């Protein structure tokens, strides 16, 4: 059987579709940051890292890259000088919108070999397996 | 729904169980190397990397680590001087055997929230999804 092998395949297959149907340039974590900042403009970097579940070094790297692409701006907080506020640029908003449409299409294509009834089973079974393993 | 999120969870859950039920020291790729060398003692490093699907740098790192733990030996090929033959030590064989038993138990526990009929569905659905995505 080999369910460890199968789980890695499933995750890799999703990563492959992200790269072919969403973007070869914007990664999933980068998009999550744009997404968090659409919902909460001006959120500080530390909190943005928390929203998307990234450590301080990875969020620093993501923010630097999005900054260099002109997709977000970073301002030192006027009040607390040792936090930085992040805000999307006009182009960052545009990129977030375009990618969102592609992501929705991509995930529909990912699940498309399954009939609607099977997709619900797919989620149920995988959730039960992941939940039980993480519950020890 | 978010199937990309779910796929990463499933893979992470398996990685968590490997670490708690198999070994915190021997990784999955390291075990795959021991496993390949039980089946084919004396296989060269390049081919071992091919059997387990690792690039030349990752296999080099795995082999160095297993070597330092006294689990495998490396000999320059008498014929072709620029290939290296790998062979498990007595302890490498013992570790492979003990881990194998743990891996079998771990994978049974991983799939255990599912009834036998559901486990077959779990494999069928995930394979269909991964196969279709990798077929573009």
Distance, in angstroms, between B49 CA and closest chain A CA? 17
Distance, in angstroms, between A21 CA and closest chain B CA? 10
Report CB contact under 8 Å: A7, B7. Answer: yes
Residue A96 in marked binding region: no
The whole-angstrom separation of Cα A106 and Cα A123 is 17
Report CB contact under 8 Å: B2, A107. Answer: yes
**Reported structure resolution in angstroms:** 2.1
| Selection from A63, A73, A74 nearest residue A27 by Cα | A63
Residue A43 in tokens: 């959120």
- Domain positions in chain B are 1-136
| Selection from B121, B30, B120, B53 nearest residue A8 by Cα | B53
- In CATH terms, B1-136 corresponds, of 3.40.47.10, 3.40.50.2300, 1.10.10.10, 3.40.50.300, to 1.10.10.10
The closest CB to that of B125, out of A11, A122, A133, belongs to: A122
Residue A24 burial by Cβ neighbours in a 10 Å radius (0-12, 13-18, 19+): exposed
Non-local CB neighbours of B48 within 8 Å, separated by 6+ positions: B33, B36, B37, B59, B63, B86
| Selection from A103, A122, A101, A113 nearest residue A17 by Cα | A103
Closest residue in B to A127 (Cα) is B6
């Amino acid at each position: 059987t080999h369910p460890g092998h199968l789980a890695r395949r499933l995750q890799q297959a999703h990563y492959l579709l992200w790269n072919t149907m969403v973007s070869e340039e914007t990664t999933s974590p980068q998009y999550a940051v744009l997404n968090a900042l659409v919902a909460e403009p001006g959120l500080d970097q530390r909190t943005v890292g928390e929203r998307v579940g990234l450590d301080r070094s990875t969020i620093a790297e993501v923010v630097s890259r999005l900054g260099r692409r002109g997709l977000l701006d970073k301002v030192r907080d006027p009040q607390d000088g040792r936090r930085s506020l992040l805000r999307l640029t006009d182009e960052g908003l545009r990129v977030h919108r375009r990618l969102g449409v592609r992501i929705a299409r991509m995930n529909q294509v990912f699940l498309a070999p399954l009939a609607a009834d099977e997709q619900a089973v797919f989620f149920d079974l995988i959730r039960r397996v992941a939940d039980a393993a993480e519950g020890l």
